Design a protein around this ligand. Structure first.
Ligand SMILES: *[C@@H]1O[C@H](CO)[C@@H](O[C@@H]2O[C@H](CO)[C@@H](O[C@@H]3O[C@H](CO[C@H]4O[C@H](CO[C@H]5O[C@H](CO)[C@@H](O)[C@H](O)[C@@H]5O[C@H]5O[C@H](CO)[C@@H](O)[C@H](O)[C@@H]5O)[C@@H](O)[C@H](O[C@H]5O[C@H](CO)[C@@H](O)[C@H](O)[C@@H]5O)[C@@H]4O)[C@@H](O)[C@H](O[C@H]4O[C@H](CO)[C@@H](O)[C@H](O)[C@@H]4O[C@H]4O[C@H](CO)[C@@H](O)[C@H](O)[C@@H]4O[C@H]4O[C@H](CO)[C@@H](O)[C@H](O)[C@@H]4O)[C@@H]3O)[C@H](O)[C@H]2NC(C)=O)[C@H](O)[C@H]1NC(C)=O
Ligand SMILES: *[C@@H]1O[C@H](CO)[C@@H](O[C@@H]2O[C@H](CO)[C@@H](O[C@@H]3O[C@H](CO[C@H]4O[C@H](CO[C@H]5O[C@H](CO)[C@@H](O)[C@H](O)[C@@H]5O[C@H]5O[C@H](CO)[C@@H](O)[C@H](O)[C@@H]5O)[C@@H](O)[C@H](O[C@H]5O[C@H](CO)[C@@H](O)[C@H](O)[C@@H]5O)[C@@H]4O)[C@@H](O)[C@H](O[C@H]4O[C@H](CO)[C@@H](O)[C@H](O)[C@@H]4O[C@H]4O[C@H](CO)[C@@H](O)[C@H](O)[C@@H]4O[C@H]4O[C@H](CO)[C@@H](O)[C@H](O)[C@@H]4O)[C@@H]3O)[C@H](O)[C@H]2NC(C)=O)[C@H](O)[C@H]1NC(C)=O
Ligand SMILES: *[C@@H]1O[C@H](CO)[C@@H](O[C@@H]2O[C@H](CO)[C@@H](O[C@@H]3O[C@H](CO[C@H]4O[C@H](CO)[C@@H](O)[C@H](O[C@H]5O[C@H](CO)[C@@H](O)[C@H](O)[C@@H]5O)[C@@H]4O)[C@@H](O)[C@H](O[C@H]4O[C@H](CO)[C@@H](O)[C@H](O)[C@@H]4O[C@@H]4O[C@H](CO)[C@@H](O)[C@H](O)[C@@H]4O)[C@@H]3O)[C@H](O)[C@H]2NC(C)=O)[C@H](O)[C@H]1NC(C)=O
Ligand SMILES: *[C@@H]1O[C@H](CO)[C@@H](O[C@@H]2O[C@H](CO)[C@@H](O[C@@H]3O[C@H](CO[C@H]4O[C@H](CO)[C@@H](O)[C@H](O[C@H]5O[C@H](CO)[C@@H](O)[C@H](O)[C@@H]5O)[C@@H]4O)[C@@H](O)[C@H](O[C@H]4O[C@H](CO)[C@@H](O)[C@H](O)[C@@H]4O[C@@H]4O[C@H](CO)[C@@H](O)[C@H](O)[C@@H]4O)[C@@H]3O)[C@H](O)[C@H]2NC(C)=O)[C@H](O)[C@H]1NC(C)=O
Ligand SMILES: *[C@@H]1O[C@H](CO)[C@@H](O)[C@H](O)[C@H]1NC(C)=O
Ligand SMILES: *[C@@H]1O[C@H](CO)[C@@H](O)[C@H](O)[C@H]1NC(C)=O
Ligand SMILES: *[C@@H]1O[C@H](CO)[C@@H](O)[C@H](O)[C@H]1NC(C)=O
Ligand SMILES: *[C@@H]1O[C@H](CO)[C@@H](O)[C@H](O)[C@H]1NC(C)=O
Ligand SMILES: *[C@@H]1O[C@H](CO)[C@@H](O)[C@H](O)[C@H]1NC(C)=O
Ligand SMILES: *[C@@H]1O[C@H](CO)[C@@H](O)[C@H](O)[C@H]1NC(C)=O
Ligand SMILES: *[C@@H]1O[C@H](CO)[C@@H](O)[C@H](O)[C@H]1NC(C)=O
Ligand SMILES: *[C@@H]1O[C@H](CO)[C@@H](O)[C@H](O)[C@H]1NC(C)=O
Ligand SMILES: *[C@@H]1O[C@H](CO)[C@@H](O)[C@H](O)[C@H]1NC(C)=O
Ligand SMILES: *[C@@H]1O[C@H](CO)[C@@H](O)[C@H](O)[C@H]1NC(C)=O
Ligand SMILES: *[C@@H]1O[C@H](CO)[C@@H](O)[C@H](O)[C@H]1NC(C)=O
Ligand SMILES: *[C@@H]1O[C@H](CO)[C@@H](O)[C@H](O)[C@H]1NC(C)=O
Ligand SMILES: *[C@@H]1O[C@H](CO)[C@@H](O)[C@H](O)[C@H]1NC(C)=O
Ligand SMILES: *[C@@H]1O[C@H](CO)[C@@H](O)[C@H](O)[C@H]1NC(C)=O
Ligand SMILES: *[C@@H]1O[C@H](CO)[C@@H](O)[C@H](O)[C@H]1NC(C)=O
Ligand SMILES: OC[C@H]1O[C@](O)(CO)[C@@H](O)[C@@H]1O
Ligand SMILES: OC[C@H]1O[C@](O)(CO)[C@@H](O)[C@@H]1O
Lengths: 624, 624
């Protein structure tokens, strides 16, 4: 095993465990110290204002198993510190008959058991578990634990009658899944149900959704309500909140609803951020965010979606969330988005970016798998004075339209996402910032034009505004992680409305994924404008490429170039002419970003272990 | 619920949990503080000379489940003190994927991991588990833990390759069971295998048996040898030590070998006690003790047996234990005997006495189930100068015979059992002792003759020597726990060779078992004697009646009389005449015995709990 990044890569499968630990590793984002991670969990703002982030964790392994909560904290979403206790950076782990198969996703009741922060999580036991298997009741239940030390440790309620698990009965038969309890307060839902509480007797101030579906009949999000305020054992099933069809799709802008939901959450937003009104705010919109399974041919069969919903009260004292419009939270290799409330009327969302090594060829050599996305403020994005001749505008697919009185302009409403400002400020302030001169892309434009200043490593951010003619057929964007032989191309093509990431040349190492990523982006044309603009922000962080367009469209993906000098970046141009020009302005390179884990050394591997021959006997975990 | 023991019992099923806690409860023996107990486990003499006793334990329940090691200690086998730690009196409990279904029986390596006492135990996980089910590999494995604090706590080795569990591969397919590792040193087996160690490479100084069987083809005791001295991970399967047939019986004196072994152990004894020679002691005999399942119509389908064996070395470097003669360790409601070495060349054996409430009618009202037997010294019982006209003597069923040179006398050899002398001394010294005048039972004998001194409660011991004519048809014995309306009759009938416990009148409460207990006892007639003698010792301890005959035959059973005055005792006589007389001598009553748990209050119940609806979902434990 040679680690010479000045020549072509050898057979890297001969390299030892964690020998490629630093080679492709993100430095500027949330990631476990080592080993396997997946979904964010247990997210909450602590009493001191800091952020507690949990995650599904399997230390010293590179596949899922014995799934536990790893945890860390931060005062700014950006610079983090690991917890360190008797189980290292773990704070909840399989320990009881009811959760021995895995401590799955859970969410936080801030004022819970004895007034302490309390997690409601999916406790798993034995038996077939999965949307395509014949799962039985009891395999997935929901259990409580609380912390007396601000997340350094958690104490589970005892096992038994009137204790853990607290939710165990399936609300309907033949479930495809029954997990990921999302606990939330909702003045909105309380107001809607206030006249029906005699029917159910559920009067608590916390609601909980559980994600799943029904075999052969599509996904389901089940709504529970805390039976009595201040009491956390009894949760009353109201009814299905979201019901979708078996592999139903709302269309090209909306992914596919698959057969089963995972990590679903419920929020209410307005243009500024989180909305906590009872329905009285006419600018507020109710949203559900959710993953779906088995409705996608690639990306691990997983869509991270969202939907704007209108709540209707059923006669039995439950709520139907009727989907008004439906979109995609991220178009690339990410999933398991969780959102949580943050002080100052914010709702912040974060997901998991998986690797692109689905055949597990170099996972052991990495010594880790997975990272988070960046943390994102959610809000209602409102675009005013939109031209009615914007192509496809009245499809109203992942947005809504309201006509002006005179019919000459439209107000567009959709889900907004933007990187939390704490991270943008810290990134910029710790980077070497190059403000670049605007570039007009015309007949003289090369295919690729390097920026006048270049990155020094694989940790940087790019921004640019691309102004296109209303009838352009030109394409433009950014090339990143680029040398002569390796590069990743991010293109926008207004004619097709497609943002793509072409990865055919991303790496000389042939075992990584190389499929082209694709997102739809609607450039809402403004009344009186003779052009349309794409604002593109790109974060390059080890192997992560995370793309944001117009504070709306997100696409996370992976690139693993071998050569040490595959770090360059610049502008891409295709079919730009004297007549069909693309004006690029607001160009800026931030080189360096932030060291997100300042207390960690460069190599936090502790080696990898094998569970031994019993792993196959038990049949629950891969074992490595 | 009335607790008036001066009148007939009401409907006791209306009584609350643990309301009958003290009513029938033993006071003078090893018993858990409350709840369910079964098999002794983890038995060893500690460095300070005290005895550590573990037991299968399910606190706050009255059926088996979440099975754990409860523990206590004693300097004299007789007066005990509970451990008290973070889990009360438990010291090992289900905590890992490999043992989450139960910490089953295990035994002690005195100089184990890092020189500490170390337990090898059966770690159980999910799946069908049982001799009549389709069990699969992995459900029962064998794991290690060690103690740095003389049994107050145990530290398990980690889960994984080269760690726990240390034995997981089934030595043959379609096992009925794979549990109860019994670790022992054996100069005998080492000498026998010394010429074959090239074939197996196993040269360690510890052996281990694992108890089981093969579906459709009878029980098996599998022999393993520690691969290397001072190393505890690698154990090498040599071969089957004991192989018996599907429900094979050696006859009327030997129970039935059933379909599966449990709690089997291996020892070597001589007339004085334990023998640690390499084979050079011609007075020493190799013994296996073992439980069998599904070879009995009652007593929970369970026989506690023993066999004298002659070891043969196989060509593949393993040992066949050929059964020479075969007997019964206890004929009544006991099972799961364990033996362990004790200083001064002793091997001490102790078992579990279950209740006689198999339909679980008053278990909750008790608030506990189970106790130990008394602790018993094992030795080779030798009877010299036996008359060749002793009926049935050359059947050699659970004994051996060697003729004198002249053929006029026989030496009989069998397994001896007697209560450890520490317990007999403590019992006698703490009791009010009445030495009773000898009684000749003839034509004047009533059916029942009370002793001249009577017990004051349900805690006493009786002794007597019953001298019978060689052709008697008379029966005699002891009545215990007796009032006019309730009593338990212990009869010996030399003509049939049957010792019986008749329990048709044991209690006015009709839900308890009332079947007649039966043991075979061979009165070895001595050359020149004109009579034959039965030495009977009986312990009455709450509901336990534990009977010993001639330091050989043991029979443990249960009686639950309701009336406060059903405590009396005396002599039984049937068919005694002027000509057929039974001479009773050596009569003694010990009233009171010992308070075996002096630090415990009278009521150590902590209440009972229900596991809730998930118990049936998981399907592993009853849940109460
Ligand atoms: C199979 O068997 C298994 C083993 O038995 C069994 O698992 C066990 O289940 C039991 C029962 O559910 C659990 O017991 C609970 O424990 C809770 C605390 O748990 C935390 O702490 C313990 C102990 O920690 C000590 O010891 C450890 C280990 O040595 C040390 O490392 C610690 O530092 C600490 O040491 C100190 O203390 C020791 C003495 O205890 C000293 O020896 C030592 O020197 C130190 O000073 C840990 O072991 C736990 O760890 C385990 O669990 C965590 C997850 O929780 C895992 O991550 C970890 O790996 C371990 O597995 C853990 O950290 C108790 O809080 C709880 O007691 C309460 O509940 C019961 C009711 O259920 C009440 O009876 C009791 O009164 C308590 O309730 C009161 O208190 C709470 C708040 O404190 C209130 O909310 C509540 O209302 C109530 O208040 C009452 O009193 C108030 C007055 O004070 C009053 O105001 C109120 O009005 C009210 O009256 C309970 O004891 C046990 O932890 C499990 N153990 C393990 C190892 O799993 C399993 O379930 C069985 N399975 C089946 C299928 O049956
Ligand atoms: C799913 O995830 C699960 C959770 O991660 C996982 O279970 C965990 O598995 C790991 C890995 O196997 C276990 O880790 C081992 O722990 C052993 C000790 O275990 C005992 O102590 C711990 C910790 O106790 C502290 O904390 C608790 C809880 O708060 C307190 O109550 C205690 O009082 C104590 O607190 C003090 O210390 C804390 C810091 O740790 C402080 O915070 C605190 O302030 C106090 O000061 C307990 O938690 C354990 O309890 C659990 O387990 C018991 C059964 O064992 C249960 O009954 C109970 O309910 C709990 O479940 C327990 O009591 C370690 O000994 C062990 O470390 C050794 O092994 C590894 C190799 O495997 C080596 O890397 C390491 O070096 C150690 O080996 C050396 O040392 C031993 C002797 O000590 C030697 O024999 C050995 O050769 C070696 O020697 C070396 O060094 C020498 C120099 O010193 C040198 O001479 C030699 O040459 C050599 O080089 C390991 O860390 C962990 O316990 C499990 N946890 C739980 C909760 O289950 C599970 O397996 C996963 N499942 C799957 C399927 O994957
Ligand atoms: C005395 O000690 C007991 C512990 O032994 C302790 O707890 C009680 O334990 C008993 C079992 O011994 C439990 O009985 C079972 O109850 C089930 C129904 O339970 C529901 O109704 C109850 C009555 O109002 C409620 O009290 C229950 O509430 C508790 O539990 C819920 C969780 O479900 C919790 O949220 C609450 O907070 C409470 O803690 C609950 O709503 C019965 O289904 C179960 O019935 C079976 O067993 C009976 C007896 O054999 C049979 O009559 C039935 O036919 C059925 O049995 C069959 O069982 C066989 C073998 O199991 C099987 O093959 C068949 O399929 C079928 O199941 C049983 O009756 C009792 O619920 C529980 N009470 C609790 C937790 O409060 C007591 O509390 C303790 N007393 C005191 C004063 O301390
Ligand atoms: C680097 O990190 C690893 C942890 O990832 C760590 O431990 C090693 O982990 C790998 C897995 O990643 C283990 O490989 C497996 O080994 C099995 C055979 O193992 C036996 O032979 C080995 C070779 O000499 C021995 O080293 C082993 O000894 C150890 O374990 C025993 C317990 O068994 C213990 O007593 C010892 O003390 C040692 O700890 C052992 O005797 C293979 O069966 C298994 O093979 C499968 O997977 C391969 C790779 O994909 C395939 O080629 C095979 O076809 C087969 O895979 C198929 O798998 C799929 C999915 O699993 C399934 O559908 C099929 O049925 C089939 O199974 C695999 O190769 C390795 O044993 C283990 N080594 C250990 C513990 O020492 C390394 O130690 C670490 N390195 C360093 C330097 O730290
Ligand atoms: C980058 O490195 C490769 C291999 O060392 C080399 O061929 C190339 O010329 C280098 N410089 C570039 C692409 O600017
Ligand atoms: C890479 O090495 C592996 C052994 O780890 C070997 O099986 C494989 O064929 C090698 N690839 C080549 C030579 O291209
Ligand atoms: C569907 O549900 C019932 C239990 O409610 C169960 O008997 C059945 O096996 C389930 N699965 C299928 C494939 O029908
Ligand atoms: C309430 O009604 C809805 C619609 O029929 C149904 O899906 C839900 O299960 C009902 N809730 C119950 C039975 O608790
Ligand atoms: C919205 O505006 C467009 C263009 O002016 C028009 O075609 C459409 O009918 C209008 N919708 C409503 C509800 O007035
Ligand atoms: C650098 O990053 C840290 C950690 O996020 C942040 O607190 C600090 O303000 C940044 N430095 C600047 C903006 O100069
Ligand atoms: C065409 O592009 C080049 C490079 O940006 C620029 O120098 C030139 O001015 C552009 N042409 C026009 C007409 O603006
Ligand atoms: C743009 O994307 C869609 C998928 O939404 C695809 O069907 C279409 O062919 C693409 N068009 C072009 C020109 O790339
Ligand atoms: C024993 O008690 C019962 C009921 O109180 C009574 O009938 C009997 O005479 C008492 N005394 C005896 C049997 O000596
Ligand atoms: C017997 O053994 C094999 C595995 O060795 C297994 O396939 C089979 O199902 C077992 N049980 C029966 C009843 O044959
Ligand atoms: C040794 O031989 C015996 C008798 O054939 C056999 O039962 C045992 O399994 C053998 N041991 C092995 C294969 O390790
Ligand atoms: C043992 O003694 C009996 C009676 O004297 C006799 O029948 C039998 O043959 C003797 N056995 C041997 C082996 O000599
Ligand atoms: C009473 O019993 C205790 C505990 O077993 C024992 O140590 C003591 O010697 C006994 N008293 C006597 C024999 O007087
Ligand atoms: C018969 O028994 C009675 C009571 O034990 C006794 O007094 C009497 O002496 C016995 N008869 C003979 C002949 O010994
Ligand atoms: C004595 O016990 C045996 C069982 O070993 C039984 O078959 C026989 O009938 C009994 N005989 C009498 C007289 O009780
Ligand atoms: O690690 C298990 C967790 O990951 C998910 O499957 C999402 O990928 C959740 O539904 C579950 O709680
Ligand atoms: O409690 C389980 C234990 O009890 C036994 O079944 C004997 O009755 C053992 O074989 C086992 O280890």
């Amino acid at each position: 095993c040679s680690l010479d990044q000045t020549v072509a890569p050898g057979n890297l499968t001969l390299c030892g465990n964690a020998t490629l630990f630093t080679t492709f590793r993100p430095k500027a984002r949330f990631i476990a110290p080592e080993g396997w991670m997946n979904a964010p969990m247990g997210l909450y703002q602590r009493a001191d204002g800091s952020i507690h982030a949990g995650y599904q964790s399997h230390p010293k392994h590179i596949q899922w198993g014995n799934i536990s909560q790893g945890a860390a904290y931060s005062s700014d979403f950006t610079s983090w510190t690991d917890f360190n206790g008797s189980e290292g950076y773990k704070t909840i782990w399989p320990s009881q008959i009811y959760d021995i198969r895995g401590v799955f996703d859970g969410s936080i009741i801030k004022e819970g058991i004895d007034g302490y922060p309390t997690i409601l999580y999916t406790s798993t036991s034995f038996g077939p578990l999965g949307a395509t298997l014949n799962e039985a009741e009891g395999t997935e239940t929901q259990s409580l634990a609380y912390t007396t030390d601000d997340g350094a440790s958690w104490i589970k309620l005892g096992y038994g009658a009137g204790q853990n698990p607290v939710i165990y009965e399936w609300p309907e038969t033949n479930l495809t899944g029954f997990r990921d309890p999302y606990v939330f307060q909702s003045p909105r839902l309380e107001a809607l149900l206030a006249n029906t509480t005699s029917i159910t007797n559920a009067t608590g101030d916390h609601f909980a959704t559980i994600s799943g579906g029904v075999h052969g009949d599509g996904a389901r999000l089940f709504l529970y309500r805390q039976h009595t305020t201040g009491e956390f054992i009894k949760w009353t099933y109201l009814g299905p909140l979201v019901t979708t069809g078996y592999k139903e799709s709302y269309g090209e802008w909306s992914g596919n609803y698959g057969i089963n939901f995972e990590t679903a959450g419920v929020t209410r937003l307005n243009p500024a951020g989180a909305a906590w009104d009872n329905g009285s705010d006419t600018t507020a919109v109710d949203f559900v965010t959710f993953g779906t399974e088995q409705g996608r041919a690639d990306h691990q069969n997983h869509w991270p979606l969202w939907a704007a919903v209108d709540y209707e009260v059923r006669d039995n004292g439950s709520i139907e969330a009727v989907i008004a419009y439906s979109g995609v939270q991220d178009w690339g290799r990410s999933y398991a988005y969780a959102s949580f409330p943050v002080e100052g009327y914010r709702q912040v969302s974060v997901g998991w970016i998986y690797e692109d090594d689905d055949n597990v060829i170099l996972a052991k050599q990495f010594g880790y798998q997975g990272a988070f996305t960046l943390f994102r403020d959610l809000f209602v994005k409102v675009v005013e004075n939109v031209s009615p001749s914007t192509p496809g505008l009245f499809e109203q697919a992942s947005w809504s339209t309201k006509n002006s009185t005179d019919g000459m302009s439209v107000t567009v409403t959709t889900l907004g996402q933007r990187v939390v400002p704490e991270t943008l400020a810290a990134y910029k302030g710790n980077s070497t910032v190059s403000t670049l001169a605007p570039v007009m892309l015309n007949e003289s434009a090369a295919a690729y034009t390097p920026f006048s200043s270049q990155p020094t490593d694989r940790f940087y951010a790019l921004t640019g505004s691309f102004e296109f003619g209303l009838n352009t057929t030109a394409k433009a964007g950014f090339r990143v992680l680029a040398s002569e032989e390796e590069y990743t191309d991010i293109w926008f093509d207004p004619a097709s409305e497609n943002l793509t990431v072409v990865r055919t040349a991303s790496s000389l190492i042939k075992s990584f994924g190389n499929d082209t990523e694709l997102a739809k982006v609607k450039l809402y044309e403004i009344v009186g404008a003779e052009s349309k603009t794409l604002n593109l922000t790109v974060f390059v962080d080890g192997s992560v490429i995370e793309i944001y367009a117009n504070d709306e469209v997100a696409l996370s993906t992976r690139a693993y170039p071998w050569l040490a000098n595959s770090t360059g970046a610049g502008l891409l141009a295709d079919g730009t002419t004297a007549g069909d020009v693309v004006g690029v302005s607001g160009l800026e390179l931030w080189d360096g970003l932030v060291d997100a884990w300042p207390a960690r050394p460069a190599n936090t591997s502790q080696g990898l272990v094998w569970d031994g021959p019993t792993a196959a006997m038990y049949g629950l975990f891969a074992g490595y």
